Design a protein around this ligand. Sequence first.
Ligand SMILES: CCCCCCCCCCCCCC(=O)OC[C@H](COP(=O)(O)OCC(O)COP(=O)(O)OC[C@@H](COC(=O)CCCCCCCCCCCCC)OC(=O)CCCCCCCCCCCCC)OC(=O)CCCCCCCCCCCCC
Ligand code: BCL
Ligand SMILES: CC[C@H]1c2cc3[nH]c4c(c3C)C(=O)[C@H](C(=O)OC)c4c3nc(cc4[nH]c(cc(n2)[C@@H]1C)c(C(C)=O)c4C)[C@@H](C)[C@@H]3CCC(=O)OC/C=C(\C)CCC[C@H](C)CCC[C@H](C)CCCC(C)C
Ligand SMILES: CC[C@H]1c2cc3[nH]c4c(c3C)C(=O)[C@H](C(=O)OC)c4c3nc(cc4[nH]c(cc(n2)[C@@H]1C)c(C(C)=O)c4C)[C@@H](C)[C@@H]3CCC(=O)OC/C=C(\C)CCC[C@H](C)CCC[C@H](C)CCCC(C)C
Ligand SMILES: COC(C)(C)C/C=C/C(C)=C/C=C/C(C)=C/C=C/C(C)=C/C=C/C=C(C)/C=C/C=C(\C)CC/C=C(\C)CCC=C(C)C
Ligand SMILES: COC(C)(C)C/C=C/C(C)=C/C=C/C(C)=C/C=C/C(C)=C/C=C/C=C(C)/C=C/C=C(\C)CC/C=C(\C)CCC=C(C)C
Ligand SMILES: COC(C)(C)C/C=C/C(C)=C/C=C/C(C)=C/C=C/C(C)=C/C=C/C=C(C)/C=C/C=C(\C)CC/C=C(\C)CCC=C(C)C
Ligand SMILES: COC(C)(C)C/C=C/C(C)=C/C=C/C(C)=C/C=C/C(C)=C/C=C/C=C(C)/C=C/C=C(\C)CC/C=C(\C)CCC=C(C)C
Ligand SMILES: COC(C)(C)C/C=C/C(C)=C/C=C/C(C)=C/C=C/C(C)=C/C=C/C=C(C)/C=C/C=C(\C)CC/C=C(\C)CCC=C(C)C
Ligand SMILES: COC(C)(C)C/C=C/C(C)=C/C=C/C(C)=C/C=C/C(C)=C/C=C/C=C(C)/C=C/C=C(\C)CC/C=C(\C)CCC=C(C)C
Ligand SMILES: COC(C)(C)C/C=C/C(C)=C/C=C/C(C)=C/C=C/C(C)=C/C=C\C=C(C)\C=C\C=C(/C)CC/C=C(\C)CCC=C(C)C
Ligand SMILES: CCCCCCCCCCCCO[C@@H]1O[C@H](CO)[C@@H](O[C@H]2O[C@H](CO)[C@@H](O)[C@H](O)[C@H]2O)[C@H](O)[C@H]1O
Ligand SMILES: COC1=C(OC)C(=O)C(CC=C(C)C)=C(C)C1=O
Ligand SMILES: [Fe+3]
Lengths: 55, 55, 55, 55, 55, 55, 281, 307, 43, 43, 43, 43, 43, 246
Amino acid sequence: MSKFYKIWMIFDPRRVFVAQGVFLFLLAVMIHLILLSTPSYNWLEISAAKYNRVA
Amino acid sequence: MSKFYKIWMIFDPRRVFVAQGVFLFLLAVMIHLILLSTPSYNWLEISAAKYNRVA
Amino acid sequence: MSKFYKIWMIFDPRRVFVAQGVFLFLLAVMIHLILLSTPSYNWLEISAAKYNRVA
Amino acid sequence: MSKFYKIWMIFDPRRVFVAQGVFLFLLAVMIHLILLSTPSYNWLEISAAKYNRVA
Amino acid sequence: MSKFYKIWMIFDPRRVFVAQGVFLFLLAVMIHLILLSTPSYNWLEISAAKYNRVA
Amino acid sequence: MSKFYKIWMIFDPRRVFVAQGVFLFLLAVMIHLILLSTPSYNWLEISAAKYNRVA
Amino acid sequence: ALLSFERKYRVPGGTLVGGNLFDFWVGPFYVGFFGVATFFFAALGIILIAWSAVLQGTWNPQLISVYPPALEYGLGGAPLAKGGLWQIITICATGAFVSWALREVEICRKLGIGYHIPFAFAFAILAYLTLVLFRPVMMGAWGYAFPYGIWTHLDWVSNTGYTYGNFHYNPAHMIAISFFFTNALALALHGALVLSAANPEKGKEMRTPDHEDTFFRDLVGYSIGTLGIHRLGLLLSLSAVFFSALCMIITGTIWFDQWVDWWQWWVKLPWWANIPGGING
Amino acid sequence: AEYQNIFSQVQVRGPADLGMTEDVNLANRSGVGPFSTLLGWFGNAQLGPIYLGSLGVLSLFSGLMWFFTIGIWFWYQAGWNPAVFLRDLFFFSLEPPAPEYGLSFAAPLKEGGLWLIASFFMFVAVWSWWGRTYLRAQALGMGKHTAWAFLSAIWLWMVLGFIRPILMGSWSEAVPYGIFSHLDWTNNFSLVHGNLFYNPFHGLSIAFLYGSALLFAMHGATILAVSRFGGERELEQIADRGTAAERAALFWRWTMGFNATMEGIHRWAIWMAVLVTLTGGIGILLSGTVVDNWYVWGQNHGMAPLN
Amino acid sequence: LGYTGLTDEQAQELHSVYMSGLWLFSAVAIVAHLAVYIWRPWF
Amino acid sequence: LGYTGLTDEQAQELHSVYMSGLWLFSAVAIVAHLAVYIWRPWF
Amino acid sequence: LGYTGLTDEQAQELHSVYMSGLWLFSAVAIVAHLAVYIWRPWF
Amino acid sequence: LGYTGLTDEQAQELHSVYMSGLWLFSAVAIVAHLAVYIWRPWF
Amino acid sequence: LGYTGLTDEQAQELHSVYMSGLWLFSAVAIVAHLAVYIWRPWF
Amino acid sequence: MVGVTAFGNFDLASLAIYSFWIFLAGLIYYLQTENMREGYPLENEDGTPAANQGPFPLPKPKTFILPHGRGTLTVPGPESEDRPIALARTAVSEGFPHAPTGDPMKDGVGPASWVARRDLPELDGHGHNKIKPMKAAAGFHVSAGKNPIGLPVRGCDLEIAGKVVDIWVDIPEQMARFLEVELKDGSTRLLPMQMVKVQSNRVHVNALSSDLFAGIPTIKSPTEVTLLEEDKICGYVAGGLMYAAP
Ligand SMILES: CCCCCCCCCCCCCC(=O)OC[C@H](COP(=O)(O)OCC(O)COP(=O)(O)OC[C@@H](COC(=O)CCCCCCCCCCCCC)OC(=O)CCCCCCCCCCCCC)OC(=O)CCCCCCCCCCCCC
Ligand code: BCL
Ligand SMILES: CC[C@H]1c2cc3[nH]c4c(c3C)C(=O)[C@H](C(=O)OC)c4c3nc(cc4[nH]c(cc(n2)[C@@H]1C)c(C(C)=O)c4C)[C@@H](C)[C@@H]3CCC(=O)OC/C=C(\C)CCC[C@H](C)CCC[C@H](C)CCCC(C)C
Ligand SMILES: CC[C@H]1c2cc3[nH]c4c(c3C)C(=O)[C@H](C(=O)OC)c4c3nc(cc4[nH]c(cc(n2)[C@@H]1C)c(C(C)=O)c4C)[C@@H](C)[C@@H]3CCC(=O)OC/C=C(\C)CCC[C@H](C)CCC[C@H](C)CCCC(C)C
Ligand SMILES: COC(C)(C)C/C=C/C(C)=C/C=C/C(C)=C/C=C/C(C)=C/C=C/C=C(C)/C=C/C=C(\C)CC/C=C(\C)CCC=C(C)C
Ligand SMILES: COC(C)(C)C/C=C/C(C)=C/C=C/C(C)=C/C=C/C(C)=C/C=C/C=C(C)/C=C/C=C(\C)CC/C=C(\C)CCC=C(C)C
Ligand SMILES: COC(C)(C)C/C=C/C(C)=C/C=C/C(C)=C/C=C/C(C)=C/C=C/C=C(C)/C=C/C=C(\C)CC/C=C(\C)CCC=C(C)C
Ligand SMILES: COC(C)(C)C/C=C/C(C)=C/C=C/C(C)=C/C=C/C(C)=C/C=C/C=C(C)/C=C/C=C(\C)CC/C=C(\C)CCC=C(C)C
Ligand SMILES: COC(C)(C)C/C=C/C(C)=C/C=C/C(C)=C/C=C/C(C)=C/C=C/C=C(C)/C=C/C=C(\C)CC/C=C(\C)CCC=C(C)C
Ligand SMILES: COC(C)(C)C/C=C/C(C)=C/C=C/C(C)=C/C=C/C(C)=C/C=C/C=C(C)/C=C/C=C(\C)CC/C=C(\C)CCC=C(C)C
Ligand SMILES: COC(C)(C)C/C=C/C(C)=C/C=C/C(C)=C/C=C/C(C)=C/C=C\C=C(C)\C=C\C=C(/C)CC/C=C(\C)CCC=C(C)C
Ligand SMILES: CCCCCCCCCCCCO[C@@H]1O[C@H](CO)[C@@H](O[C@H]2O[C@H](CO)[C@@H](O)[C@H](O)[C@H]2O)[C@H](O)[C@H]1O
Ligand SMILES: COC1=C(OC)C(=O)C(CC=C(C)C)=C(C)C1=O
Ligand SMILES: [Fe+3]
């Protein structure tokens, strides 16, 4: 493990950090969208039914 | 934590603030549009129903 | 707060004032369009209903 | 407000005056056309109904 | 066996690391998607049935 | 047998290893898909029947 | 009257047919043996269209419409008022188009330039002959060709298309559209780029081709170059027309059903035809 | 046959070209990419560099979010199944709000709220790319011809997605994001408006579209035919007319009685292509707002026979 | 010292003028929002 | 040291300003979320 | 050494700060998952 | 020596670190599989 | 001599470890087939 | 607004289509007058101004500022050939061909024509010579296709004229512009890359027989070629398509 820091001698940190920022946002967006698309986990619909906010 | 300030030694601050401002604007609009699409959270439709303006 | 002025050593005020001007106008138009598209807040329709001007 | 005249140190008045002129005209035309499209505010149609010109 | 390290005398480690990282994420996503699309292994629907989260 | 090593006088190892890695992965994926397309060897469906996980 | 540089080029020869007999100009227009032919066929076809308007009983040029023979004539000659005029005008059109191309060849020869232009025009001719000749004779009647009339040939396009449902689903037609849209894009970019270099910001020097490369590399990360863009514009245009002719010559000859149904071959590939869900399951 | 100059016989390669500097901020250029020998047969081999300033970050990230939003909707329509995703790919569609929602933003995510979100990302992406075309020209001191030409394409795109829906008063008028669905929308639009062939601006737009293929066939063939004289060095022919430009002019003069110049043919080029979408956007904007049945309109304007 | 070539003195001055524009615009916006909320509450 | 050429002193100053903005922006957002949760709980 | 031109000390310096970000982001994520699990278990 | 320019020592160094990442990733995946198998056996 | 520029001994070196990769790879496969065959014989 | 007419059938769609025709007429007038910046006024075949000049008047002059201190071009402006033209009338009336009075290849007339361009090289964006012999171009090498250097050059008589000794390359556009051919007498010539066909064992020239290669115009310095010299060389080679003997 402890020698992993040499990755910054192979990969330019600027390119990695841009690539990783795009990666983590799109991953996080995808998972939230999956859960919104899921009737058991859409928190907005769950709270609507819980508090009798709709219909 | 305390050494995070060295980010500005590798990234040009002009690019970072642009990329961050772009990100924050697009995210903020996206969330407000999600809430507007959500009947339990569309504040304009909520206030219409609250005040009998929906007619 | 007090050091925020140093942003003008980072960004050219010509570019910033153009970008801000475009942004604020489009945002204002966007919000007025949303409200005109919303029956409970279309001020022309509200006025027409209030004063019995139509139909 | 007293120093707002420095905007002309930053922006060419020729480009500003042209951009402003196009903007104000397009805005004015849009608002009049919205009101002509709005039945309660089409002043020609209001005049016809007022003076019994419709037959 | 233990001469395997000479692979880095042939392959540029940057191109290997990029290729491998793309490969491993796309493979992982592919497998999670196969399981989400498999009714016996969709963990979101399995838990919805276990906890009676619909009906 | 013994002289097969002379293939690396003919073929550059870098190009061969890329082609070989791609070949082996696609061959593996092909065989796994064949088995998944086969009711007697789709392990996910065999599992679902063995544990009565669907209906 | 000459352009100020023109005289040095107006030399004898380069003709395919007729030698010096027709090797002369009428104002700007070079004549040649095929110029005589082109004018005769063009004039005759034009006057026969006007005569067809007399028979039709209209002088509104938007309503003038020369219809091909009814299907009952097959590939035979029809009465002139009942589609035989369309037959003669189609021969005139074909004569004029081919004569025009052959005249361009001898203009190329006199000027010493390549033959790319008449070669490119031959694609347009072959597309025309696809719709009036090759496809009608495969289908066995002249009545499958389009009528010569400004709006009525669009009725033929509409009626032919909806015979096969929404004609967008013809796969060769999709390819042809993509080349047509791509060509118009490339033409706009090419015109704009050359003009933006020749006509810079006020008081600046003309930009070089190096600036043209730089602008496109900066914009999209690639520049095809000054030779490559003219190669591209030609091949995009010709490919659009080639796939246009292909999409029609197969239609009603090897394909007969609603074109939307063709795409089911992909959906019903056996390794996924039966998987539930999606749009087709 | 003799050599036709459609593909190069010999490729040569030298030091990579980093481009002209002018007023470009060189820190925002990437490095040079690889050289494609496959592309080098037809055009330049060099890939890159690319410029990636502030509007480019805005445009690409907004465009990515547009494309990703449609993509995740397609994966949802596929039931997350990779085999179904590839089977039904051209059949998936992100559809605008239904008519009963009008122009409102209250429509549910599945019922067109996601279409609005994607359309917002598209709007920002395209317009910020327009400013990118303008500013890349500015930094090199070039004329803005490319940005103004691109505004004609944006005019049709704006009419389709934004202006006509607002004038018609519902988002349901807009184009769905989907391969076959946008074709189906195209067919449906014509059937609803009583045959779009009788829209005269659609007819003009077709004339300019065909004219663009005609004119680029002519111009491309012409420049290749004079390329033996250096004709494709068009800017130098503009600055110093050679026999290439003279032979090109005289071919068309002797053929059809008139000709262009080496500059002015590109003025024909830009306008021929621009007029496609300029007339296009007018024709669509008139459809349903002013004329709901173009065939009947054509009957009343002397272009179709009366019933 | 920075990328734009504005001095710190110029940057401080420009910011003071800019912020007075921002406060002016936002004050008008605040008054506009209060009037609309008084007229037609959106909560 | 580093790619931008900023001095370590410049980087420390710039970060202190940036973080002052981040904490300001996030404080407003936290107040907004509290007001919305008190108004209309999403859990 | 290195394709990036960083020294070993520079790479080790940078990695220490990157890893502290990764662990902080991971810690927030762990708390988020724990909260969502206690709220609504997915197993 | 090598096409990449990495010396034998540089290749040995790099491989030792790469292989430790490979085994770390493998160990996490093995724990992940083991947990899933106990939760819901596929065989 | 060689199209790769490898010497004879370099080709012997590279081949000797390449074959050990194949033998490792196939040995893992043989265990995989053994386990699968024991689970569900295809003959 | 559907069905709303100002008069008769004059719809808002009618206003649009009539407005477009007026715009298009103006645009076509603009486009044609912009395309009259070269070659006009029209001349009689004796070179005097023609009595007919056509319906479009000439545009106002425009000035291009040329790069690298090459000066200014203003167009339209006084056209002149500034070289002898060895053509004589075949007929007293207009519209007939003008016959060559000597050797049209040597005289540079007909398809052998060349224009009196600047006798300076074309410059790249940095002001270096755009076209250089590849032996002088620092990093340049053949990257794909058959390398032509050292191939024999065959004339269309099927006899060998010489051998290829270098490629001349477009530096900013990175493409082969000419082949330099060493002739039998040991002098060299430039052949345009578009007028040669490279083959596995030869370079074939369809435009010239082997006896014509000596007549290809020479460059005055061995390291650069002027725009004038390019026009002379390219003109002469293409002229061989008409005037090379059977
Ligand atoms: C915004 C979305 C909408 C759709 C919008 C679609 C717009 C499409 C425009 C395409 C233009 C391509 C040609 C071109 O050269 O472009 C570059 C040019 C110059 O670049 P530069 O960097 O600024 O300058 C460089 C410098 O060296 C000079 O270069 P150059 O010499 O080449 O420039 C002169 C050109 C440019 O002129 C124009 O572009 C005029 C564009 C007019 C468009 C009108 C179309 C719609 C109206 C028709 C609809 C008709 C149907 C309804 O000169 C010319 O090209 C001259 C053309 C002459 C045409 C004459 C027509 C006369 C007809 C009337 C006759 C009456 C007789 C009694 O740029 C410009 O000059 C600015 C162009 C501005 C475009 C219109 C912007 C939107 C206007 C409307 C909203 C704002 C005003 C209310
Ligand atoms: C049954 C079908 C109907 C019909 C219905 C329609 C409809 C409906 C429309 C047309 C339109 C068009 N029709 Mg019609 N049409 C029919 C029959 C035809 C026939 C024929 C031979 O029968 C032809 C040749 C045409 C021809 C044409 C074109 C002239 C015109 C489109 C121009 C264009 O480029 O658009 C394509 C270009 C654009 C839409 C501009 C796009 C610009 C934007 C900014 C690009 C963004 C890209 C995005 C960000 C992604 C980039 C990703 C990359 C990877 C980077 N039609 C029949 C009668 N037609 C259009 C028009 O203008 O009508 C007047 C239109 O709306
Ligand atoms: C192949 C790629 C594109 C292409 C290329 C192309 N066209 C070309 C050329 C090239 C390279 C020429 O060199 C040549 C030319 O000289 O251009 C100015 C030509 C040309 N392309 C033309 C038109 C044209 N090209 C078209 C298409 C295309 N041309 C393709 C998209 C279209 C359409 C509808 O898409 C048209 C209208 C002409 C301007 C010109 C050919 C002129 C010619 O043939 O002249 C001799 C003939 C006449 C002057 C008139 C003949 C009259 C007939 C005897 C009677 C009419 C019969 C006709 C069938 C009636 C139809 C009625 C309509 C309402 C349907
Ligand atoms: C005058 C009319 C013609 C026209 C002109 C025209 N178009 C133009 C221009 C001009 C003059 C430009 O200047 C501009 C341009 O830049 O051209 C190169 C443009 C352009 N015309 C375009 C397209 C286009 N033009 C078309 C047509 C036309 N263009 C007409 C025929 C058509 C069609 C349907 O006919 C299309 C599709 C673009 C190439 C470009 C405008 C680009 C733009 O606005 O892009 C915004 C979006 C993005 C920048 C990115 C979108 C998302 C991508 C998927 C990228 C993702 C990147 C990410 C890093 C990777 C993610 C991977 C993961 C998801 C796995
Ligand atoms: C259709 O079939 C399905 C999909 C259903 C089933 C079949 C699936 C198949 C066929 C799957 C195949 C999977 C395979 C082939 C997987 C292979 C996985 C491997 C080989 C993974 C390797 C991982 C390695 C890792 C994570 C290594 C990490 C290393 C580091 C982080 C450190 C890198 C080194 C450094 C920093 C040292 C630098 C040193 C110097 C001197 C600069
Ligand atoms: C769908 O989602 C909806 C729309 C419903 C909700 C979403 C809403 C969102 C995301 C809203 C976002 C809003 C934001 C971020 C607003 C930001 C507003 C700002 C920052 C406004 C700033 C205004 C500033 C102004 C007006 C300043 C004017 C300044 C001047 C006039 C003076 C300029 C200085 C000069 C001239 C001095 C020059 C000095 C020298 C030395 C030359
Ligand atoms: C369904 O029924 C169907 C339709 C299929 C019936 C039809 C069947 C047909 C038409 C079958 C056709 C079969 C044929 C034509 C088979 C041919 C097979 C051959 C020729 C196989 C050859 C294999 C050769 C091998 C594996 C050789 C390998 C060699 C090496 C590994 C060493 C290479 C040499 C080296 C390294 C030395 C290098 C030397 C120096 C000095 C460096
Ligand atoms: C997918 O479904 C949904 C969208 C519902 C759920 C998912 C949501 C997701 C994935 C959300 C992700 C959110 C994230 C990652 C948000 C991160 C936000 C951050 C990092 C915000 C930071 C903001 C920082 C600000 C506003 C800083 C401002 C700085 C200033 C005002 C100071 C400016 C002046 C300076 C720097 C001058 C100094 C100059 C010198 C010379 C010293
Ligand atoms: C069901 O849905 C699907 C199908 C999607 C399920 C599958 C999901 C999958 C396949 C998920 C895979 C996830 C993976 C591979 C995630 C990996 C995440 C990683 C690598 C995260 C790393 C995070 C690192 C962070 C947050 C670092 C932050 C750093 C900072 C905040 C400080 C900035 C950097 C500095 C100051 C360094 C510069 C310093 C100096 C001295 C120069
Ligand atoms: C059609 O229907 C189905 C598919 C069901 C039936 C048909 C199946 C068929 C036809 C299957 C065919 C399978 C075949 C032909 C498989 C062959 C596989 C092979 C050849 C695998 C070899 C693997 C080799 C490996 C993993 C080697 C790895 C090597 C290393 C790790 C060493 C790296 C270091 C080196 C080489 C040293 C470098 C030295 C220096 C001095 C720099
Ligand atoms: C592999 O899987 C992943 C997820 C990784 C990637 C896959 C991606 C996929 C499969 C993407 C698919 C993309 C497709 C098929 C795209 C199709 C696009 C088409 C054909 C579009 C056609 C026409 C679109 C038009 C005319 C749109 C015009 C839109 C506008 C003018 C925008 C106007 C703005 C609006 C309506 C927003 C108003 C709202 C606010 C809040 C201002
Ligand atoms: C590029 C140009 C494309 C268009 C070319 C058109 C060329 C037309 C040539 C026609 C040649 C003569 O064609 C001839 O027509 C007659 C009259 O219809 C056909 O005659 C057919 O119809 C008549 C009645 O209408 C019957 O009496 C007869 O028994 C039947 O065969 C002949 O079978 C056919 O041989
Ligand atoms: C015939 O129909 C086809 C498809 O869907 C209908 C595809 O998705 C695909 C695959 C995807 C793309 C983007 C071409 C192909 C190749 C195809 O041919
Ligand atoms: Fe051109």
